[PDB]
């Protein structure tokens, strides 16, 4: 039977980028043609594989990661990027094999009073490894004196709100992103096009 890509693309609610969702897809026939010609996408970039070649390829597992970010930050979802999102929220490896798909979600994810449910990690001591997920809310220590879980000077909550408002310029508008990874192990493949 078919692979459940619509459960990812057509999801009503999306995860904050710091707590990005990942769907593991296995033991199914993937129909990439209908998937890529459904909605209209503002960003479609594939690395190490062509979108039309996927129907011919088989993979052990296919991962579909999804999250929401700002329009100005979509450029950071690509191999070899740096920035607050790539360093502290969602990082792709330098030899990434897959596709990055994004579309404007201003109608779904912005509110008249501002949507503060979507967050990103602002402070982190070190950069994330590729495909690493950090959901901690530990008070960030920016000085010599420890915080002991109490906010204060040099003691910052690690997450920051986006506050999406439908009239913002597109750089500040929310975008839903889906990243398709293609893991090729020396195991019997379960997902073919």
């Amino acid at each position, epitope marked *: 039977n078919l692979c459940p890509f619509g459960e990812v693309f057509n999801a009503t609610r999306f995860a904050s980028v710091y707590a990005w969702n990942r769907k593991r897809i296995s033991n199914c026939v993937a129909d990439y043609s209908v998937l890529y010609n459904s909605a209209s996408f503002s960003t479609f970039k594939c690395y190490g594989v062509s979108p039309t070649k996927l129907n011919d390829l088989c993979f052990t597992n296919v991962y579909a990661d999804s999250f929401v970010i700002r329009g*100005d930050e979509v450029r950071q979802i690509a191999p070899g990027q*740096t*920035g*607050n999102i790539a*360093d*502290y929220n969602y990082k792709l490896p330098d030899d990434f094999t897959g596709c990055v798909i994004a579309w404007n979600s201003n109608n779904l994810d912005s509110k008249v009073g*501002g949507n503060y449910n979507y967050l990103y990690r*602002l*402070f*982190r*001591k*070190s*950069n994330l490894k590729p495909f690493e997920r950090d959901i901690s809310t530990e008070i960030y*220590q*920016a*000085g*010599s004196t420890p915080c002991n879980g109490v906010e204060g000077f*040099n003691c*910052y*909550f690690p997450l*920051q*709100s986006y*506050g999406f*408002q439908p*009239t*913002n*310029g597109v*750089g*500040y508008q929310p975008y839903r992103v889906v990243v398709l990874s293609f893991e090729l192990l020396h195991a019997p493949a379960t997902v073919c096009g």
Partner: antibody
Amino acid sequence: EVQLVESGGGLIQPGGSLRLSCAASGLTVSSNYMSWVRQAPGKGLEWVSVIYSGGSTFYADSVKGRFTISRDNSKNTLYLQMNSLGAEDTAVYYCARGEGSPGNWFDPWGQGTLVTVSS
Amino acid sequence: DVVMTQSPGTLSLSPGERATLSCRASQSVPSSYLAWYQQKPGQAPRLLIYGASTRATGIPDRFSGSGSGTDFTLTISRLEPEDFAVYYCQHYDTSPRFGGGTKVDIKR
């Protein structure tokens, strides 16, 4: 007792290089967003570069390829290496913790140091 | 990428009056991205207001910021001689941006 004390300014000939220093007390340089902001005489404020606690660096287009921001953890000090200097680089250079963004504003600021590019 | 424009260039008010400083844009900018900085002669810039309207620590109450979308305002009630300075609005889109600044002169 939070302070950013700057040094390194002065005269430098066109095409030469110079290195500015921002010594911090009251905050850990390697743990923060740390920025350089400059101001040409009689003119406005211009952000120049930032270094993330995680190590990433970014530069304004006007200094890309010529400037290099860095830090020394054991000295708790921020640096700006300026190369290929020209008349447009004559300015007071400030350091600041932050990057002028939500939850991450420019605060505090160093007292600034004047760089004069002349022959 | 949003260009913000401050007005007027210079403001000349007697002490005790109310100073209104504007920072306008062509596109709407979320209020949480707006900040104001004060720079007195010879000194370094000082953060006055952040998040469009939140007063920075130790800033006197007579400074207040407001506005949203395309029109952000800094108000200085009960203007004092010490308030003589240049005030900059500031925001981040893809990099930190500073407005051109508004100079506040004080009549006497």
